[model samples]
Target: SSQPDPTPEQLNKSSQFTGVMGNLRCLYDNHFVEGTNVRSTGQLLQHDLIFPIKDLKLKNYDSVKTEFNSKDLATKYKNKDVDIFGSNYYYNCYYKTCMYGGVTEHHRNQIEGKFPNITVKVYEDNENILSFDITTNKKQVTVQELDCKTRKILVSRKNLYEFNNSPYETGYIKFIESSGDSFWYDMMPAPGAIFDQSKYLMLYNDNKTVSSSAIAIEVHLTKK
Candidate 1:
């Protein structure tokens, strides 16, 4: 049977992330030179401030830049040419062409949606040029499903970052996702569950090659 939607009272008492109904918006705008090793404009989307609700304010627009050198950028452009006229002619044939070249509005929208409250700043200082800060009033809820039959719990943690950035050791777990999903929560533990020092990490054996999926869930026990 299909489950009915939660009532107001049930929603109020729900343990899910609070204020998740409020929409989230992200914006990324800046120009980057190649070979910079910049932190990443997308990091703004990973900030924890946006999880719980209210409003997130992102400043510090000085961290995003391209990680490629000029030579690399030139090589990328050169690789795109088809030797049309033997002059390294690079034609950006696409669905739409605009002032920004062949970039489409849909592509722009996707980029905007991917990075909310984000701003990129280019400076002469050679240091990081993009910065952001997020502010929100939402609570976070993590869920795990335990398969008692298999003696394993499927732990899925989602949010701003991947497993490496997660608070655990690397290669301890595996990660997976469907073709159309992109929110970073599509990970699980594998092989069953095991204990490290005092925490428990689940190991997942999906066919994917990413390690961001496997994660450890911390549980504390108390006797009353």
Candidate 2:
């Protein structure tokens, strides 16, 4: 039959990546965070501090602007220890919305999830404009299932990426929820989200193509 559901521990394991020729290589994830369940590998091209993405001419993938009123922000972040100023603030967000899921004899729609594994980077420039950059890196393969549908066949296609604008050693944001669950926020850019360590900030993802289901590691910034 098909691949079994991944255990929570498996899902918590980090996806593996390798570096070659000064570029990044994505090996595999214990669980298929984004796309289908198949052994896939790919690479990311690096140009100094920028990891440029090839324009497929499919979607714009530009940053989207969102504004939040002071009162609303105060209400949402009431007990979260984040300061809510009286002035309104906005966030210009950029994130990935699509990925190449593994191919199968069964239709792509029949596969379970084809969401993108989101990597969030939060930063504030001198202009006080909070900017966000999100990226997804993964591979897909076209394969035929064995006679009993127990395994896959051959690799046919692949895709990968590692977008950012700063050094990777500075560490990222980890939101630990009240329920004790947690996830990552890359914050891998200039003046990182916690550069000043001020508890006033916000984050949003603009990948709304498939509603909310298309996101593998769905972002929930509610956790302080």
Candidate 3:
């Protein structure tokens, strides 16, 4: 504790630093970008729900391997319990100061409440890839069928136009009807739409008469 004033070079030397100096040196090296000036993060709650799937790598994705145990896979994932419900730093930095807020149940409730009926399930649909199975036993059909021959319930995750043809699906389905026409519309989300949206809708109509009605289902996933 009684040494002469060290030279600037000595002070600049990393080895000369101790305790917090050493820790700070490492933090600046790994956790920050070069020439960073302002650093702050927004307040937010964070939590992760983890579900375990048997890790397997297939040689080809297009075809299913004969040895693949579809039944066993189904049995294991039958219980969608979350293996871990843990909190992590909001920002990528590990420093305690970088964390803005603590985990809260409010965030948890928001995510869980988004899709109450449509749950996330994993089943062997004869596909080798891991995909989410969104299903609901409840369905409704409300086509007025004024004078139409065929009635259809159209479900789409995309826009209503993409669900069927032109004419922004407004007002009664009767407006879009033609006399005694047979029409079959697609009944699923387009591509990655399901993963992106929490709510999806179903529209039904017939050639004779139709009502401008929609059925919305909230998609939800729960911890096993």
lDDT of 2: 0.22
Per lDDT, the best of the predicted structures is 2
lDDT of 2 by residue, 171-219 (tens): 2333332244444433222232222111122222111112112222222
After superposing candidate 1, which stretches have Cα over 4 Å from the reference? 1-56, 74-168, 172-224
Greater lDDT among 1 and 3 belongs to: 3
- lDDT of model 1 at residue 182? 19
Which candidate, 1 or 3, would have the higher TM-score against the true structure? 1
Please give, for residues 1-224, the per-residue lDDT of candidate 3 as tens digits.
11232222222222222223222112112221111111112212122111221113421121111111234432332333211111111223321212111111112122222332321211122222222223221122122121111111121221212222212212111122223333222222233212111111112101111221222121111111
Error of 3 at 155 (Å): 14
In model 3, the worst 10-residue window by lDDT is: 59-68
Model 2: clashing residue pairs? none
Top-scoring candidate (TM-score): 2
**Candidate 1 lDDT by residue in tens digits, 1-224:** 22232222322111221322111100001111111111111211111000011112333222211111123332332223211000000123111110111101111122212222212121112333323322111111011111110111111222111222222111111112223221222111222222121011111111112111222222211111
Show the lowest summed lDDT stretch of 10 residues, model 1. Answer: 81-90
TM-score for each model: 0.16, 0.19, 0.14
Q: Candidate 2, after superposition: displacement of residue 203 in Å?
A: 24
